[PDB]
Motif scaffolding. Structure first.
Motif, short mmCIF file in Angstrom:
data_model
loop_
_atom_site.label_atom_id
_atom_site.label_comp_id
_atom_site.label_asym_id
_atom_site.label_seq_id
_atom_site.Cartn_x
_atom_site.Cartn_y
_atom_site.Cartn_z
N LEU B 3 -3.61 -1.49 8.50
CA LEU B 3 -4.58 -0.54 7.97
C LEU B 3 -5.49 -1.30 7.01
O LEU B 3 -5.01 -2.02 6.12
CB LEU B 3 -3.90 0.61 7.22
CG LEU B 3 -4.85 1.53 6.45
CD1 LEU B 3 -5.79 2.24 7.41
CD2 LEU B 3 -4.04 2.55 5.65
N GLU B 68 -1.10 10.49 5.73
CA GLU B 68 0.06 9.97 6.43
C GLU B 68 0.34 10.66 7.77
O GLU B 68 1.25 10.27 8.49
CB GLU B 68 1.31 10.08 5.55
CG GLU B 68 1.67 11.51 5.16
CD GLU B 68 1.03 11.95 3.86
OE1 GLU B 68 -0.19 11.76 3.69
OE2 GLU B 68 1.76 12.50 3.00
N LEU B 72 -2.09 6.99 9.20
CA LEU B 72 -0.93 6.11 9.30
C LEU B 72 -0.18 6.05 10.63
O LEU B 72 0.31 4.99 11.02
CB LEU B 72 0.05 6.43 8.16
CG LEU B 72 -0.52 6.19 6.76
CD1 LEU B 72 0.57 6.42 5.72
CD2 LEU B 72 -1.07 4.77 6.64
N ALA B 75 -1.88 3.53 12.75
CA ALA B 75 -1.83 2.19 12.19
C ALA B 75 -0.50 1.49 12.46
O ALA B 75 -0.33 0.32 12.11
CB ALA B 75 -2.10 2.24 10.70
N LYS B 76 0.44 2.21 13.07
CA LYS B 76 1.75 1.63 13.37
C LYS B 76 1.74 0.87 14.69
O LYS B 76 2.63 0.08 14.97
CB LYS B 76 2.82 2.72 13.40
CG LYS B 76 3.06 3.40 12.06
CD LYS B 76 4.22 4.38 12.15
CE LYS B 76 4.54 4.99 10.80
NZ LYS B 76 5.74 5.88 10.86
N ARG B 98 -2.19 3.29 -0.55
CA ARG B 98 -1.54 2.05 -0.15
C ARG B 98 -0.03 2.19 -0.27
O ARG B 98 0.73 1.52 0.43
CB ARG B 98 -2.02 0.88 -1.01
CG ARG B 98 -3.51 0.59 -0.90
CD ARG B 98 -3.82 -0.80 -1.44
NE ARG B 98 -3.35 -1.85 -0.54
CZ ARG B 98 -3.23 -3.13 -0.88
NH1 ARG B 98 -3.54 -3.53 -2.11
NH2 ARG B 98 -2.81 -4.02 0.02
N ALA B 101 1.07 3.97 2.79
CA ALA B 101 1.06 3.03 3.90
C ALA B 101 2.36 2.23 3.90
O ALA B 101 3.00 2.07 4.94
CB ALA B 101 -0.14 2.09 3.78
N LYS B 102 2.75 1.73 2.73
CA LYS B 102 3.97 0.95 2.61
C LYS B 102 5.18 1.76 3.06
O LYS B 102 5.97 1.31 3.89
CB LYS B 102 4.17 0.50 1.17
CG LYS B 102 5.42 -0.35 0.97
CD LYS B 102 5.69 -0.65 -0.49
CE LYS B 102 6.97 -1.47 -0.65
NZ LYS B 102 7.29 -1.75 -2.07
N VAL B 106 3.54 0.40 7.09
CA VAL B 106 2.26 -0.13 7.54
C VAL B 106 1.66 -1.08 6.51
O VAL B 106 1.52 -0.73 5.34
CB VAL B 106 1.25 1.02 7.79
CG1 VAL B 106 -0.08 0.45 8.26
CG2 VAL B 106 1.81 1.99 8.81
N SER B 108 -1.24 -2.97 4.62
CA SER B 108 -2.63 -2.62 4.36
C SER B 108 -3.36 -3.74 3.65
O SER B 108 -2.77 -4.52 2.91
CB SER B 108 -2.72 -1.32 3.53
OG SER B 108 -2.27 -1.52 2.20
#
Ligand SMILES: Nc1ncnc2c1ncn2[C@@H]1O[C@H](CSCC[C@H](N)C(=O)O)[C@@H](O)[C@H]1O
Lengths: 265, 265
Positions: B3, B68, B72, B75-76, B98, B101-102, B106, B108
């Protein structure tokens, strides 16, 4: 008849904006300065190849003393570009150059680019909480400047973060590391005893902002002072009291110790 | 999979960095938000044409409540980009994204772009002299925000400049003008009567930074409060005590009254 102040951005040759690149490519003459700061992730050659034009480098003297004799004469009958690292006019001396342009009857325009001043947002610290900024200068001979220590003190007491630009000997391409800055600050503390910077102070180090792989680390001085943050440039930040959201970002993204969630919030 | 948070810059589609453009062009999915700021010199169509990808615009609710669930997941297994005006992490709450994302597993990356936070350098005011920043928010119902007044007070007492982000209601197409901000400040002044913001206070207005010809004006509130600074976005600045060179630039470039040249040291 036109002079363009164009920012090159943070780290490498692709940090210039599309606008800056397209304008630079159409200029008859292109000058650049690398004394206010450097572009550590690239070389003059790579910037030149990207722009597709010869890049005439200017020293601090060329600019501060002879800007009107070197750049403006050509800008009078041609489109001229003046490249600078980061965002134009962040460096304090750049602004006055627009007055010189006006005095010479030359139109000037500014093409912005990312600056470390705003890039620090990647630390997760809220931008609005940053107070006055300062530069940590290497002491020399009998001169030991310490104004940056007072800046931290004043910001911190008001709950604000302090962005610390680190010394750079552009000409010699030598950078002060965050480690060196921490040692100096500890040295200054031992002299002023203001309780502003100690082994227990929480700091944030941001290295190579602009890169896809910057180093973002947060922790106490005692633990980070001998840590390797990678290649230059390094930026040091002494945050003030943290909003829980800022602390959680530092822990999850910058590897900060869980302790900051209860000690620095 | 990955991402990318990519800033689009200050005014038009060309304010994106070359790095940002080259990465966006190669992403599988591209999302964006246009509620945190206003890019007055472009259109979604022009941005889409530049990157060569369809852009899925998200609302504040989509992002804040379902980032999410919308972004997200893709983005996987794909390269995804999330575009934003200016710099993605400045004066936004996007940094927290972010962390999401973590937790979603994922990785970023952040690609910076010109931000109004540093573009104010074009006003000629020394960037390091800016203190805490604030936002002038539209009053709503019986609630009338006033925190920004205290920020100005605090900075001014230290001789620091104050950057005031102005409110925006994207879905309603409402962009606070410098004029409306000055009117609100005068009302807060009548309430707190701290002598912080009056008709005799010197202010600076920067409108449409990023464009080639932004409006840069400096003068006393009594004279600028009814002045037309052009289309939004606008930002308001209340300078602290001026350095001689700052005053010179405001007079020469921003049309400030010549009397400010005479600084009271
Ligand atoms: N080009 C521009 N000119 C003047 N003000 C601007 C501007 N872009 C943003 N702003 C100001 O900032 C506010 C949005 S705050 C979000 C800022 C953005 N992340 C950035 O990096 O710039 C706007 O309401 C306006 O007051």
């Amino acid at each position: 008849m036109v002079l363009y102040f164009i920012g090159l951005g943070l780290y490498d040759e692709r940090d210039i904006t599309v606008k800056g690149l397209e304008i630079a490519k159409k200029c008859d003459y292109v000058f650049a300065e690398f004394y206010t700061s450097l572009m550590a992730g690239t070389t003059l050659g790579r910037i030149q190849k990207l722009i597709g034009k010869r890049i005439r480098v200017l020293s601090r003297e060329d600019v501060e003393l002879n800007f009107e004799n070197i750049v403006l004469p050509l800008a009078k009958e041609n489109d001229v570009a003046f490249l600078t690292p980061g965002d134009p006019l962040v460096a304090t001396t750049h602004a006055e150059l627009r007055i010189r342009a006006k005095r010479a009857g030359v139109e000037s325009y500014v093409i912005h680019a990312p600056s470390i001043y705003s890039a620090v947002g990647i630390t997760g610290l809220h931008i609005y909480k940053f107070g006055k900024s300062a530069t940590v200068a290497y002491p020399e001979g009998n001169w030991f400047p310490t104004s940056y220590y007072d800046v931290i003190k004043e910001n911190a007491e008001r709950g604000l973060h302090t962005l610390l630009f680190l010394d750079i000997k552009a000409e010699k391409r030598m950078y002060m590391t965050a480690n060196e800055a921490m040692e100096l600050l500890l040295k200054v503390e031992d002299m002023k005893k203001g309780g502003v910077f100690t082994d227990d102070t929480l700091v944030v180090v941001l290295a190579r902002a602009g890169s896809l792989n910057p180093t973002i680390r947060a922790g106490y001085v005692k633990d980070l002072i001998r840590e390797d943050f990678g290649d230059p440039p390094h930026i040091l930040i002494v945050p003030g009291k943290l909003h829980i959201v800022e602390a959680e970002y530092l822990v999850e993204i910058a590897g900060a110790p869980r302790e900051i969630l209860r000690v620095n919030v």
